[PDB]
Every structure is written in C-alpha cells, then in structure tokens.
Structure 1
Amino acid sequence: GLPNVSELVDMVYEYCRKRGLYPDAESYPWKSNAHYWLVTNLYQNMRANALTDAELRRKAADELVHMTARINRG
C-alpha cells in the first residue's frame, strides 16, 4: 500500500540525504512509481519553498490523499 505521512516524510529526508549518490532522480531505488512521484514532488516543493518539517508533513498528507484517490479509481 501507500506510505503513511510519517513514513513518507522519512523517505523524503532519506532521498534528500542519498540523492547525490545516483545519476538522476529516476535512478534512485524506488519501490513503486508511487514512491518516485510522491517523494520527488515533495522534495522539489521542500527545496523550492524552504518548507519546515510541519509544512512538509501537511503537503505530504495532501499528496497522499490525492494519490489514494488516483489508485482507488484504477
């Protein structure tokens, strides 16, 4: 299933920490297309907006609701 908000925020921070080891964002080791889209969107929003941890958590929760709805309808 999808990550919960805490799991997803941890993934964003790990990606933040590890992304320099890889040739590009797509080459990072994603367990699903969902993880790639969730994490890279939140990372870029983090980066381009200096999001606080609480702000990141709110965006992550919204992204997870949109993605749950997408998967729910096929």
Structure 2
Amino acid sequence: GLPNVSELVDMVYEYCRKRGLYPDAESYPWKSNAHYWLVTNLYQNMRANALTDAELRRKAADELVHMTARINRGEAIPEPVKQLPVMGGRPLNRAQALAKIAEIKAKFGLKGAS
C-alpha cells in the first residue's frame, strides 16, 4: 500500500541521504515505481523551491492524493527512460598502444614531440 505522509517524508529523507552512492536515480532500490516517482518528484520540488518541513509534508500529501486518484482511475506506470549502457570490452595492452604510436609517427613524422 501507499505510505502515509510521515512515511513518505521519511523515505524522501532517506533517499536524499543515500543518493550519494547511486550514479542515477533509477539505480536506487525502490520498493515500487510509484514510490520512486513520488520521492524523486518531492526531492526535485524541495531542491528547486527551498520548501520547509511543513511545506514538504503538504506537498507529500498532495502527491499521495494524486497517486491514489490515478491508481483508482487506472493508468500504467512505465519503466523510466534509462540512459546509455555501460559498454566495455577493452583487451588492449601497452605494446599495441606503442605500436600504434610508432605507426602514426612514421606515417606523419611532423609530431615534434620530445
């Protein structure tokens, strides 16, 4: 079930404290997508508006009411957007790099590096 106002505020504070070790908000181990959306929206709003504790609680209550209304009316929550893979696959060594350097210098010669 959806957390109450106090629980939502506590979760937002915990996410704010713990976000330092996550490369992105999607990497956070959210209990559900709705919790992710609500907590991130509250964090962004309070960071961009310098809200107080009472204002933060009021915004959390409004977001909870909106989420409950949307759930009662249906709708579907997608899986964010994501941003780029991690890539990899670099089986390169120093000798091959030096060979590339020598080939480039031989092809050009005008490097002028000493």
Work out whether the TM-score is over 0.5: yes
Deviation at 1:49, TM superposition (A): 0.6
Deviation at 1:23, TM superposition (A): 1.1
Q: Superposed, which structure 2 residues align to 1:38-53 within 5 Å?
A: 38-53=38-53
Structure 2 residues without counterparts, runs of 5 or longer = 72-113
How far, CA to CA, are the matches of 1:31 and 1:22 in structure 2?
16
Cα RMSD (Å): 8.0
How far, CA to CA, are the matches of 1:39 and 1:47 in structure 2?
12
How far, CA to CA, are the matches of 1:69 and 1:29 in structure 2?
25
Deviation at 1:42, TM superposition (A): 0.1
**Aligned positions, number:** 72
Tell me what 2:21 maps to. 21
Deviation at 1:31, TM superposition (A): 0.4
Structure 1 residues without counterparts, runs of 5 or longer = none
How far, CA to CA, are the matches of 1:33 and 1:10 in structure 2?
17
State the 4+ residue runs in structure 1 displaced beyond 4 angstroms: none
TM-score (norm. length: structure 1): 0.94
How far, CA to CA, are the matches of 1:3 and 1:55 in structure 2?
18
1:3-33 deviation line (CA, Å, top 9, x unaligned): 1000000011011100011110010110000
Larger Rg: 2
**Whose relative contact order is higher, 1 or 2, with alpha carbons under 8 Å and at least 6 apart?**
1
TM-score (norm. length: structure 2): 0.61
Structure number with higher helix proportion: 1
Identity of aligned residues (%): 99
How far, CA to CA, are the matches of 2:12 and 2:51 in structure 1?
12
Q: Superposed, which structure 2 residues align to 1:53-64 within 5 Å?
A: 53-64=53-64
Deviation at 1:53, TM superposition (A): 0.6
